[PDB]
């Protein structure tokens, strides 16, 4: 029998940044009505996967080192889980510009593999976690869930293809999959290739920070804990075949973000280097999340508070990030 | 076009299939003015749907390579020197995608990434990704322009849309000179007889039943393969990098109307039409507007009644080609 008297939750990509946050919160009892959960984490431990992100919750977590593209493995491990969440993906735009083959393999073929295995296993609730970048760029105003897909980068096009095959399963078979799309996340345990942890860890070592292009690109920032609470709202109250935005609550140019980061670590603008722009760089992302707010989601982490906590986290976790910075350097 | 060599050199992935082989046969025959004496490379993995018989008449003008568009190493050695790359390679049967879509995502998405990346490194100046009206979903009234949102419903359509999206991301990120075409249902000689028109023709010619699914009120816009290929060639000659181009169908028919036309065209009876329950992944209506490409000079030449009659005559005269295919399908 593959299920007992507590909920059983399957988290693909659960050794990464957002997925491990979701697992740690679920196990800690942060989501009401999900107490004493059994959690299965499936993660292939790419450069971004890190078992240190789960080291405190191994009594509740069954870890499976494997790939979402492995359909035989999924058929063996999925049965008995009440919820499947897919955080597994290649997620760095600059890596996708250098080589996108693994982005299409994991972010599209892997979604087909997981959705098909969920269909056969009868998993009753499935969440495909996705991104605002599938919409391209928006100069003014915000995207609602009806906005057309127009991805510009290979990462965003791969995420969009994954959403499209998941939605095709919902529409063709009645697969009970829901899509979430969110702004840029930040918080503890983010791999330090993304702009906030890269800038923080470099400033903490007295190194320079590389500001792409003219610095006027706009991102809408959300703390990972609010992203995961939005995802849990979708788990508990969303409907099959629907997309749900989870919006940021700090819309900043990269110049403004840089000012906030420098202020939070006592840094100086003399550390900021202008560097050539990213190819095809998206100018601006903005989401409206009225749809999910109507189901009771509300962010709890103001950017000033979340950034202060995140600076404190990186300041205290050199043991975790120094080996990652060393390799990337 | 300024060919790199003395004659143009055209690379056709999926050129042993239905539409791709028609394109090759027309190009070799000189049907496209300005493209005579071309050297043609056909790359095709010969799935259940590939057929070297489709290229029998152009054997001595075509270099055939049995290979997969996902084979980036092969593409890196075969692509250099080609002026144009056209990608007809795909899994294309909706009902097959309902049974198992894994190969649809592999060929129709990963295979497009593979081909675009190899084209980037090889410096190919003109690339055409052949795609489908099904990426837009269903439309109750009117026709889709090229700015219509992608909203595919079936696994086949979602896979084709995923391929278009990564192709367009290469156009936007690198300036890759790729163009996308989208078209409704094709028919004509050498179509594999799993598709509705050759399925009906070959079954009726053997005195067997033909299946009509559901209420039969699904609507499709039909185009003869030769007009589709001339639209594709218009995109080759007049299109622009990063742009989508529709090629419309000039016979809009319910499946009830299509069934009547097919029965009439072969002399069959409604007694042969087996009514069967609806199936899962077929949209209510597709319709494209092709004003954009018509402004670049495209115009269809085959009216449906004449093209259907030609196609019936072709299947009657080419049992040697389709009988093994029908036998295997059962
Ligand atoms: N980080 C953001 O700002 C952001 C914003 C919106 C959406 N998202 C989405 O949220 C998801 C998680 O993002 P993240 O920042 O935590 O990513 P991450 O890069 O920190 O971690 C990715 C995880 O996926 C694992 N993985 C990769 N490929 C796999 C495969 N084929 N099989 C199994 N595991 C695999 C990796 O080992 C790793 O643990 C992703 O789908 C991403 O697209 C992220
Ligand atoms: N048939 C239609 O009605 C129609 C309408 C609009 C668009 N299209 C598109 O036009 C293209 C051609 O369609 P068709 O009707 O000729 O398809 P088809 O089924 O007749 O032939 C597909 C060809 O692709 C080959 N192939 C498949 N996967 C391959 C791979 N990974 N590598 C190399 N070769 C591979 C097959 O061997 C075969 O020869 C496809 O992209 C299809 O999506 C078709
Ligand atoms: C990693 C990085 C990003 N950026 C910019 C690019 C984006 O506008 C923003 C966030 O980039 P990133 O963290 O890569 O996320 P995403 O591409 O998902 O938005 O910061 C830099 O200026 N420098 C850097 O070193």
Author numbering:
A (entry chain A): -4 to 324
B (entry chain B): -5 to 324
In the authors' words:
Herein we identify a new glucuronic acid decarboxylase from Micromonospora belonging to the superfamily of short-chain dehydrogenase/reductase enzymes, EvdS6. Biochemical characterization demonstrated that EvdS6 is an NAD+-dependent bifunctional enzyme that produces a mixture of two products, differing in the sugar C-4 oxidation state. At a global level, EvdS6 displays the SDR enzyme architecture and is a dimer with a buried surface area of 2371 Å2 and 2362 Å2 in ligand-free and nucleotide diphosphate-bound states, respectively.
X-ray crystallographic analysis of EvdS6 at 1.51 Å resolution with bound co-factor and TDP demonstrated that the overall geometry of the EvdS6 active site is conserved with other SDR enzymes and enabled studies probing structural determinants for the reductive half of the net neutral catalytic cycle. To better understand the mechanism of catalysis, the commercially available UDP-GlcA was co-crystallized with EvdS6. This resulted in the appearance of new electron density in the active site of each of the two protomers in the dimer. Surprisingly, the electron density at the active site of the first protomer is clearly consistent with TDP rather than UDP, but no density for the glucuronic acid was observed. In the second molecule of the dimer, electron density suggested that the different EvdS6 molecules in the crystal were bound to different species, resulting in a mixed state. Although the density was not readily interpretable, it appears that about 40 to 50% of the molecules in the crystal are likely bound to citrate from the buffer. In terms of the nucleotide diphosphate-binding residues, the TDP binds at the interdomain interface of EvdS6 and has multiple direct interactions with residues of both the N-terminal domain (E128 and N179), and the C-terminal domain (V190, P205, Y207, R214, N249, R273, and H276). Notably, the binding of TDP is associated with the structuring of a loop between V270 and D284; direct interaction between the side chains of R273 and H276 with TDP facilitates this ordering. In the ligand-free structure, no traceable electron density for residues R273, K274, or G275 or the sidechain of H276 was observed in one of the subunits. The change from disordered to directly interacting with the TDP suggests that this flexible loop could be involved in binding and coordinating the substrate in the active site.
